[PDB]
Structures are given as structure tokens and as C-alpha cells.
Amino acid sequence: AAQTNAPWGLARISSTSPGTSTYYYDESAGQGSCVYVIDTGIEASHPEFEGRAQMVKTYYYSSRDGNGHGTHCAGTVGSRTYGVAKKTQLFGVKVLDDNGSGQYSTIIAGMDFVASDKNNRNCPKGVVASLSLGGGYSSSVNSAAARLQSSGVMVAVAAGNNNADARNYSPASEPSVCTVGASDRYDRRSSFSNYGSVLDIFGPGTDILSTWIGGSTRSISGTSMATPHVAGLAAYLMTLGKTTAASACRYIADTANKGDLSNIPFGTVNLLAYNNYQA
Ligand SMILES: [Ca+2]
């Protein structure tokens, strides 16, 4: 398949080079996989989701996304126009309030929720979780992310937007998950992206067009936007049978574009997510 005039980030994850605008992908498009978006919720009624999105848990008085961030992330995972994995099922877990903040105890509960709830869903090709959130180091937050990964979910987490070493942020610093940095359309590390040895991979994170609340769309930037590209790529590759949840991060790193990015400090991987699709 070929989607012309795609968002630059989709085009980038199907290309060996910057500067193209078509997204190429296998038509299976993540069918039979599931992605949990652990964030501010998802506006499931958005037509871009085509009935494939639903809210499954909230820790607040409503399951509505009153912020937009979670809807934007879900759109990059799996919306029809803006998504990597255009046929995946999307499950929203609202651990962040409508101001975009959440207590660590609530975030931990949401991760343990996903580890159990996957047994209540039909995801024969595999289960992914996209965690576009983060704060200071907490061993409890890291151990919750580690447990989720151990349960058989591919966990993708944002490196954080502090232009600092991700070792000092959670769940970014948990070694066993897939920690995602952000790049821009000219293959530079995004100026805000955290870095360090704990990073596994970079994805597109600057000026990312996706869905928003009110049935709308907008471009925004962050490692939060890079993370759902990687989560959607994992869902896509699972459906193709190329990898499993336990192996997906290593598979993505093994098949990534190498050495493309500038401004990677020594000790941090120089790797940009790539779907290796050949039509
Ligand atoms: Ca890792």
C-alpha cells in the first residue's frame, strides 16, 4: 500500500532517506493486534478511528479526553489518515487528567490494568502499550512498566522532553521497555528530546499531524509523539509475524535506519525506526 501526501513522520518510518512524503506499508496494517494508549483518554467517536477505538478504563470522573493529547497519540498509532497501523484496535486508559497530569500511583494502576485487561481482549497477533508520559525517577513506576512488559505486552515509553539523560526519568529509565527519543524531519534529534544509553530507538517527534478532540486535527511536538510511531510500528510488525511482544523492541532496533541522525551523543544509539517494507 501507498498513502500519498502522508504526514512526514509516516513517510519517514517507511523510508531509508529523509525528504519523502508517501507512506508505504503492507495492507495488513496491524489487523489482529491491539494497542493500549495510556494517556488522557481517546475520543473514540472520531471518524478517523472508524469504530476501532474504545475507552476501557478511567481513574477520573469521566473517560472523555478533555485534553487532546491521548487522542493525538492514538491517531498516530492507528487512525486511518495519520496512523502507522491503520487496522489495529485501540484501547484507551485515562491515567492523566484533562490538564495532562497524573499521580504516579494512578499511572502504576493503569499499567497493572493493561497487564490484566489484555486477557479480556482479542489480540491474536499481539498487544502493545504506548506510554506518552513521564516524570522523575521512581523505582515503583519503573517496576510497573517492567511488569507490563514481562506480562507479554510490548511497552513503548517516551524518553522525555528535558534535553537531558533519560536515566533520571520514569518510566523512560526502565531498561526492559522500549524507550523512544524524538527526531525532526531533517533527521536531527529534536532539540527537547532526552538522550542517553537507555534509549532504544528514535521516532518522528517534531511537528506531527494527528487527530485531536472535537473531531479535529493538529500538529504538535514531543517524545510523546515519537512513542506512538514506535508502538504502531510494533503492532504492524506483529501482525506481519516478524516479531513478538517480547522481541519487538530488539527487532525494531535491529532493522532500524542506522547513522541517519545528527546530534546523538556518544553512548546513545543512533537508530531511527523503519518498517523495511518492500512492495
Ligand atoms: Ca530498553
Swiss-Prot record:
Ca(2+) 2 binds at T16, D260. Disulfide bonds join C34-C123, C178-C249. Residues 7-279 form the Peptidase S8 domain. It catalyses: Hydrolysis of keratin, and of other proteins with subtilisin-like specificity. Hydrolyzes peptide amides. Its EC number is 3.4.21.64. Its cofactor is Ca(2+). Binds 2 calcium ions per subunit. Ca(2+) 1 binds at P175, V177, D200. Keywords: Calcium, Disulfide bond, Hydrolase, Metal-binding, Protease, Serine protease, Signal, Zymogen. It comes from the Eukaryota. Belongs to the peptidase S8 family. This is Proteinase K. It comes from Parengyodontium album. The chain holds residues 106 to 384 of 384 of the full protein.
